[PDB]
Design a protein around this ligand. Sequence first.
Ligand SMILES: *[C@@H]1O[C@H](CO)[C@@H](O[C@@H]2O[C@H](CO)[C@@H](O[C@@H]3O[C@H](CO[C@H]4O[C@H](CO)[C@@H](O)[C@H](O[C@H]5O[C@H](CO)[C@@H](O)[C@H](O)[C@@H]5O)[C@@H]4O)[C@@H](O)[C@H](O[C@H]4O[C@H](CO)[C@@H](O)[C@H](O)[C@@H]4O)[C@@H]3O)[C@H](O)[C@H]2NC(C)=O)[C@H](O)[C@H]1NC(C)=O
Ligand SMILES: *[C@@H]1O[C@H](CO)[C@@H](O[C@@H]2O[C@H](CO)[C@@H](O[C@@H]3O[C@H](CO[C@H]4O[C@H](CO)[C@@H](O)[C@H](O[C@H]5O[C@H](CO)[C@@H](O)[C@H](O)[C@@H]5O)[C@@H]4O)[C@@H](O)[C@H](O)[C@@H]3O)[C@H](O)[C@H]2NC(C)=O)[C@H](O)[C@H]1NC(C)=O
Ligand SMILES: *[C@@H]1O[C@H](CO)[C@@H](O[C@@H]2O[C@H](CO)[C@@H](O[C@@H]3O[C@H](CO[C@H]4O[C@H](CO[C@H]5O[C@H](CO)[C@@H](O)[C@H](O)[C@@H]5O)[C@@H](O)[C@H](O)[C@@H]4O)[C@@H](O)[C@H](O)[C@@H]3O)[C@H](O)[C@H]2NC(C)=O)[C@H](O)[C@H]1NC(C)=O
Ligand SMILES: *[C@@H]1O[C@H](CO)[C@@H](O[C@@H]2O[C@H](CO)[C@@H](O[C@@H]3O[C@H](CO[C@H]4O[C@H](CO)[C@@H](O)[C@H](O)[C@@H]4O)[C@@H](O)[C@H](O)[C@@H]3O)[C@H](O)[C@H]2NC(C)=O)[C@H](O)[C@H]1NC(C)=O
Ligand SMILES: *[C@@H]1O[C@H](CO)[C@@H](O[C@@H]2O[C@H](CO)[C@@H](O[C@@H]3O[C@H](CO)[C@@H](O)[C@H](O)[C@@H]3O)[C@H](O)[C@H]2NC(C)=O)[C@H](O)[C@H]1NC(C)=O
Ligand SMILES: *[C@@H]1O[C@H](CO)[C@@H](O[C@@H]2O[C@H](CO)[C@@H](O)[C@H](O)[C@H]2NC(C)=O)[C@H](O)[C@H]1NC(C)=O
Ligand SMILES: *[C@@H]1O[C@H](CO)[C@@H](O)[C@H](O)[C@H]1NC(C)=O
Ligand SMILES: C[As](C)(=O)[O-]
Ligand SMILES: [Ca+2]
Ligand SMILES: [Ca+2]
Ligand SMILES: [Ca+2]
Ligand SMILES: [Ca+2]
Ligand SMILES: [Ca+2]
Ligand SMILES: [Cl-]
Ligand SMILES: [Mg+2]
Ligand code: NI
Lengths: 423, 591
Amino acid sequence: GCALGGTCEDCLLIGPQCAWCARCDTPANLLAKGCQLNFIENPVSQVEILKNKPLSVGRQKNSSDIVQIAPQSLILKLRPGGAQTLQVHVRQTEDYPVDLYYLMDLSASMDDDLNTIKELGSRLSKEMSKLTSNFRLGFGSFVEKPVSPFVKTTPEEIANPCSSIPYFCLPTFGFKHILPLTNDAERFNEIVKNQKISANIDTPEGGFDAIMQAAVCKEKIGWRNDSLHLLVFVSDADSHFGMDSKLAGIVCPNDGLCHLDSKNEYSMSTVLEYPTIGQLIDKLVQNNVLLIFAVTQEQVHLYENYAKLIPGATVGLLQKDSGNILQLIISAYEELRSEVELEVLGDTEGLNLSFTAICNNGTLFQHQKKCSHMKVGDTASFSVTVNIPHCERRSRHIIIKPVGLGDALELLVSPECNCDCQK
Amino acid sequence: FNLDVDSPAEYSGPEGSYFGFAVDFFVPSASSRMFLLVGAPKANTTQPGIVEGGQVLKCDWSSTRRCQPIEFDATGNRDYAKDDPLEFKSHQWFGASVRSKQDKILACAPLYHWRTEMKQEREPVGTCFLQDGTKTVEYAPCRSQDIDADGQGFCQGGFSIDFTKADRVLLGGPGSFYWQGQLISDQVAEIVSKYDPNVYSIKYNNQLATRTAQAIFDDSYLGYSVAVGDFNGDGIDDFVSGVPRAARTLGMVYIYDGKNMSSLYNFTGEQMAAYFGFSVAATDINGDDYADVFIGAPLFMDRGSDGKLQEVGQVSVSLQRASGDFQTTKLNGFEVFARFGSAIAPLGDLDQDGFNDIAIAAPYGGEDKKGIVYIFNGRSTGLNAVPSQILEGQWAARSCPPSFGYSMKGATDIDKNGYPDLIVGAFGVDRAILYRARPVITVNAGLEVYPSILNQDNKTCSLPGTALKVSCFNVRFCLKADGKGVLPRKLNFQVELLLDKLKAIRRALFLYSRSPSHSKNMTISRGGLMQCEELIAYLRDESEFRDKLTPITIFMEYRLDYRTAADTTGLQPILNQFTPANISRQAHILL
Ligand SMILES: *[C@@H]1O[C@H](CO)[C@@H](O[C@@H]2O[C@H](CO)[C@@H](O[C@@H]3O[C@H](CO[C@H]4O[C@H](CO)[C@@H](O)[C@H](O[C@H]5O[C@H](CO)[C@@H](O)[C@H](O)[C@@H]5O)[C@@H]4O)[C@@H](O)[C@H](O[C@H]4O[C@H](CO)[C@@H](O)[C@H](O)[C@@H]4O)[C@@H]3O)[C@H](O)[C@H]2NC(C)=O)[C@H](O)[C@H]1NC(C)=O
Ligand SMILES: *[C@@H]1O[C@H](CO)[C@@H](O[C@@H]2O[C@H](CO)[C@@H](O[C@@H]3O[C@H](CO[C@H]4O[C@H](CO)[C@@H](O)[C@H](O[C@H]5O[C@H](CO)[C@@H](O)[C@H](O)[C@@H]5O)[C@@H]4O)[C@@H](O)[C@H](O)[C@@H]3O)[C@H](O)[C@H]2NC(C)=O)[C@H](O)[C@H]1NC(C)=O
Ligand SMILES: *[C@@H]1O[C@H](CO)[C@@H](O[C@@H]2O[C@H](CO)[C@@H](O[C@@H]3O[C@H](CO[C@H]4O[C@H](CO[C@H]5O[C@H](CO)[C@@H](O)[C@H](O)[C@@H]5O)[C@@H](O)[C@H](O)[C@@H]4O)[C@@H](O)[C@H](O)[C@@H]3O)[C@H](O)[C@H]2NC(C)=O)[C@H](O)[C@H]1NC(C)=O
Ligand SMILES: *[C@@H]1O[C@H](CO)[C@@H](O[C@@H]2O[C@H](CO)[C@@H](O[C@@H]3O[C@H](CO[C@H]4O[C@H](CO)[C@@H](O)[C@H](O)[C@@H]4O)[C@@H](O)[C@H](O)[C@@H]3O)[C@H](O)[C@H]2NC(C)=O)[C@H](O)[C@H]1NC(C)=O
Ligand SMILES: *[C@@H]1O[C@H](CO)[C@@H](O[C@@H]2O[C@H](CO)[C@@H](O[C@@H]3O[C@H](CO)[C@@H](O)[C@H](O)[C@@H]3O)[C@H](O)[C@H]2NC(C)=O)[C@H](O)[C@H]1NC(C)=O
Ligand SMILES: *[C@@H]1O[C@H](CO)[C@@H](O[C@@H]2O[C@H](CO)[C@@H](O)[C@H](O)[C@H]2NC(C)=O)[C@H](O)[C@H]1NC(C)=O
Ligand SMILES: *[C@@H]1O[C@H](CO)[C@@H](O)[C@H](O)[C@H]1NC(C)=O
Ligand SMILES: C[As](C)(=O)[O-]
Ligand SMILES: [Ca+2]
Ligand SMILES: [Ca+2]
Ligand SMILES: [Ca+2]
Ligand SMILES: [Ca+2]
Ligand SMILES: [Ca+2]
Ligand SMILES: [Cl-]
Ligand SMILES: [Mg+2]
Ligand code: NI
C-alpha cells in the first residue's frame, strides 16, 4: 500500500517496505517503473560492529583480559517499522572474583543461630577457595524500625526489648553495617562472636531497609568492580515493605540513596518508608547485586515468590539453628555458575524487544533470555530483535549485559527517516 | 475534562504540619455556607505539654481563604493517678483521617497511645473526636478491656473512617489481634449519648464489629482503608475494606454486611506485594444504580514492550451486577514509580452527562515528582479507560515529596454552579487546592449542501459584475447549543466556512464575496431551536480548473466566545469532549 501514501520523507514513513524513486512504491516495483538503483533510496536497517572481542576462556591471569560477552559495542541503525536481530554470545570464566555480604537477622529467635555461625567465615572461605582465588566477605545486621507500633515504646521496653521474658537483649535497630567485605576470614569470625540478639519479634521485620542500603552504598560496603555481588539474606520471619510504615507515621517514600552515617548505621529508618520490590529490583540490577534468601520453612514459599520478580535472586531452606548455611551458600553459588540471564538497561518504554535462548547446541527456547544447567565454560547465544514503532528525535543508548557479571554490550540505536535526495 | 486549572483556590498551612494529609468538604444543613476540611496531623496545638498533636482546619471559601483550626480537644494528657499519665496525645497524628456528614465532623488520631488501667503500658489504641452541631464527644472503640497486641492495644482505631447514608460510623483498625485488623461500626446516637468523660472504655449495645480469628489470619491489616455502599440490595450501606497484607502479601478486600457484620464478597490481588487494598472506593460508575467497587494497588508492577517489569500501579474496576457477580476490569498506571492508585476519590457527575465520574491520583508522578491526578469519566459500558483530563502539581519539593493527590475529595458543588468540585491535598508542601468545574456546552452543529451533485453546465445563478452566469448551489449551516446548571441563556459563536477544504486551485467559492471563506458571528440561544443561516456558493468556470475528479468538501468550524460567556468570577464554560467543533460535507461532479 505504498501507492496510496506518497514527499520522499513521508513516503518512507507509511511503511518499512516502501521506497521513493528520486512515486512512492516498493523497490521491486520501482525497477519495473524504470527507476535505477542509484535513484532508489532505501534507508534499510543495518548493524555496524565496533567492538567484537572474542570470548576469553580458561583461567586468565590478567583480570583486564577477561571477556564474557560478544560483541561489546554496536551502532544499530533502524528503520521505523523495520526490525533487526542481534546475536549476543555470553560465557562465564573459570576464575572470577566473588564478593559475599552476610546480612543477618538479629532477632532473639536467631540466638541459637549465632552459636553455630561463630566459625563460618574461616569455614566458608576454605571451601570457596577451591572455586575462586579472589573471595571477600562482609557482615551486616538488621531488626526493625525502632518506632511504634513495630516496637513497644515504654521506657523499660526501649532499654531492654526482652525485659518481659526476661533475657538480655540489645535495643532494636534498623540496620547496622559492621564489616566491609575483605579477604580476612579471621576478622569475620571475631565479629560474629561480638554480636548480640535484639528484640524477640514474631511479626515481619525491617529486612528490606538493609537490602537497599547494602546494595546502594558501594563504597561503604566495598563492592569490587568486576566480581559477583552476593547478598545473603538470613532471617526467620517475613519482611515489611512499602507503605507498611504508614502505621508508624512514615509517609515519605524511600529514595534509593545511601544513608549510612559516620557510625555505619541506617540513619533514615525513621524518616523513609520501606523500599518496594519495584524499587529493590531497580537498585539490585543497577548495582549488579545477586540476592540470596536464606529463610526457614515458614518463609520459603513467601520468599520464593519474591525471587521470581527479582532477576538473579534465589532462595534456600535454612535450618532453625542455621547449621546448613554453608551448604546453602555454596550450592546457591554453583547454581549461579549455571545460570546465564540477559538484562536490558536504558532502553525505551516504547521499544519492543524479544528474546530467544539458545542453550547447549540444539536447544532453542522461545520468549526466554535465561539459560540453565550449563557447566562453566559453555557458550550461551541469544537472539535479540529490536524494533522502533515511530520515527523519534535522535539516537538512544541501551546496554545489554548478563546478570551478575560486569561485562556489557553497548547499543547505539539511531533511527532514520530522511532521504538521501534531501541533501 | 471540565476542571479549571487556570485559577484554582490555593490553601496552605504551617510548615511541617502535613497540611493536606486529609481533605474533605463541610456543608451544614440548609442555608449555611460551604467550608473545607484540611487535616494537619503534625501541627502544633495549644494543648498543655503536647508536641505535634495535630489539628483539623476549617477553611473558608467565601472571600478570603482563611482557615481556622477546629477545637475538638484543648485538654492535655489526663492522669490515671498522681504523676502517672493515662494517655499520650503527643505525636498522635490527629487529623490523619477527616470525614464529614452534614453537620457532623469526625477526625481521628491513629497514633494515640494509651496506658492500660492495670499495668503501665503505652499502647496505640487510637482515638476519634466526633462533633455535632453543638455537642462534641470522644470515640475510642479500641480503648477497651481487651489489652496488649492480642487484643486491641495496637489497634490504631480511626486509621480509616467513613460515614454511611443512615448516619452510622465505619471505623478500621489494622493492628487488632496481632494485626489481623478489625472493622468497628457504631451508631452516631450511641457515640454521643453513651459518652462519658470519666469512662475510658465505653461499651456500646448496637455495636457491629469483626470478631477475632485464627492465627493464620495474623498480619493482614484489615481496616487499612474503608468505603460504603449497598451490595445485598437491602438499602443499608455495606462495609468495604482493603486488606493489603492478606494471603501472604497478595492483598485482599473484604466486604461485610452493614447490618449484622456478615461476609458478603471478597477480592484478591494478583501480584506479590503490590499493596492490593491500599485504597478502596465505592460509586456507581455505569449509571445502573449499583455501587461499583474500586481497588487500588500502587506498587503493582507491569510488563512493558521491552519485556521489563516496571512499577506503575493498578486500579481494579469491579462493576456490580444484579445477578451478584462482579465484572472486574483492571486499569494500569502511566509513569514509573508514580504509584498510580494511591488515592481514589469519586467525583459524582463531574460533567453532568448522566454518569458518575472518578479521580485516581499518582502522588509521586510528573516533572520533579510534583504530583499528578487523573480524571476518568463513566459511561453505560462502564468506566472509560482513557482519562479526559490531567491535573498537574505546581510546587517543588522541600524534603518530603509534595504528594499532590495523596488525599482528595470531590462530589460536592461548592460554588452552586450545578457541577461538583474537587479538593486535592498536597501535605508534602502543606497545601490544599480546590479545583472548580466548568459548565459543559453540548452543541449540535448542522451543515447542508444542496444540491450535492453539481451540474457544471447548469449556470442558474447570475453573477454580479459580468453578464456570464455560473453554476451555483446552496450552503446551509445551523447551530444549536444547550447545557445544564448555571450558564448564560445567550451564547456567541464564531462560525467559519471553507469551500473545497482538501484542495492548489480552489474550484468553488461564495457568490457575494467571491471568496472560498466566509466569517459570520452567531448569537444562539440556550435550549432553543437551531437558528440557521443560508448562503449561495457557485462553481468556477470549466476553463479555470481541470480537476473534475476530487470531491469539493464544504467545511464549517465554530468556536464559543469564552470571554463574554464567562461567570461573574471569571469561570469560563467549556464545550463537550467527544462532540467535534467542526463538521464537513462534500459535493461531486458528473464529468
Ligand atoms: C472472605 O474471606 C475471609 C478470609 O478467609 C473469609 O472469612 C473467613 O472465613 C472462614 C470460613 O468460615 C473462617 O474460618 C472459620 O473460623 C472459625 C473461627 O472460630 C473461632 O472461634 C471458635 C470459638 O468461637 C474456636 O473454636 C475456633 O478455633 C477452632 O479452630 C482452631 C484452629 O483453626 C482450633 O485450634 C480450635 O480447637 C477450634 O477447633 C476459632 O478460634 C471456625 O470456627 C470455623 O470452623 C468451620 O470449619 C470447621 C471445619 O471442621 C467446622 O467444624 C466448623 O463447624 C466451621 O464450619 C471456620 O474455620 C474465618 O474465621 C474467616 N476469617 C475472618 C477473619 O473472619 C470469608 O469466608 C470470605 N467471604 C466469603 C463470602 O467467602
Ligand atoms: C445478616 O443479614 C443478611 C441480610 O439481611 C442475611 O442474609 C440473608 O441470608 C438468608 C440465609 O442465611 C437468606 O435467606 C434465603 O434467601 C434465599 C433467596 O434466594 C436465594 O437463592 C437464589 C437462587 O434461587 C439466589 O440467587 C439468591 O442469591 C442472593 O443472595 C445471596 C446471599 O444469600 C447473594 O450473594 C446474591 O447476590 C443474591 O443477592 C439467594 O441466595 C431463599 O431462596 C432461601 O430459601 C433463604 O430464605 C436471605 O435472603 C439473605 N438476605 C439477603 C440476601 O438480603 C444474613 O443471613 C444475616 N446473617 C445472620 C447471621 O443472620
Ligand atoms: C465578530 O465577533 C468578534 C468577537 O467574537 C469581533 O471581534 C472583535 O471586534 C471588535 C471590533 O468590532 C474589536 O474591538 C476593537 O479592537 C481593536 C484592537 O486594537 C488593538 O488591540 C491590541 C492592543 O490593545 C489590546 O491589548 C492590550 C495589552 O497589550 C490591552 O491592554 C488592551 O485593552 C487591548 O486588549 C493590539 O495588540 C491589536 O493588534 C489591535 O491592533 C481596537 O483598537 C478597537 O478600538 C476596538 O476596541 C475586538 O477586539 C474584537 N475581539 C476579538 C476577540 O477579536 C468581530 O469584530 C465580529 N465581526 C463582525 C463582522 O462583527
Ligand atoms: C511543634 O513544636 C516542636 C517544638 O518542640 C517542633 O519541634 C522541633 O523539631 C525540629 C525538627 O524538625 C527540631 O530540630 C532539631 O534540632 C536538633 C538540634 O538541637 C540541639 O539542641 C538540643 C537541645 O535543645 C540537643 O538536645 C540536641 O542534641 C542538639 O544539640 C537536631 O539535632 C535535630 O536533628 C532536629 O533538627 C527542633 O529542636 C524542635 N523544637 C524544639 C523546641 O526542640 C515542631 O517542629 C513543631 N511542629 C511543627 C509542625 O512546626
Ligand atoms: C441548477 O442549479 C440551481 C441553482 O442551485 C438549482 O436550483 C435549486 O433548485 C432546488 C430545487 O427546486 C431549490 O430547492 C428548493 O426546493 C423547494 C421545494 O419546495 C422550494 O420550495 C424552494 O423554493 C427551492 O426551489 C434550490 O433552492 C435551488 N437553488 C438556487 C440557488 O436557486 C437547480 O435545481 C439546478 N438544476 C439541475 C437540473 O441540477
Ligand atoms: C475537525 O474535527 C476533528 C474532530 O472530529 C478534529 O480532529 C482532531 O484531531 C487532532 C489531531 O491531533 C486530535 O488531537 C483531536 O483529538 C481531534 N479531535 C477530536 C474531537 O477527537 C480536527 O482537528 C478538526 N479539524 C480542524 C481543521 O480543526
Ligand atoms: C569502577 O568502574 C566504574 C565504571 O563503571 C568507574 O566509574 C569506577 O571509577 C571504577 N572504580 C574502580 C575502583 O576502579
Ligand atoms: C550483528 As551480530 C553477527 O552480533 O547479530
Ligand atoms: Ca533460631
Ligand atoms: Ca447492604
Ligand atoms: Ca454500577
Ligand atoms: Ca460524568
Ligand atoms: Ca462547581
Ligand atoms: Cl505525651
Ligand atoms: Mg527474626
Ligand atoms: Ni462523484
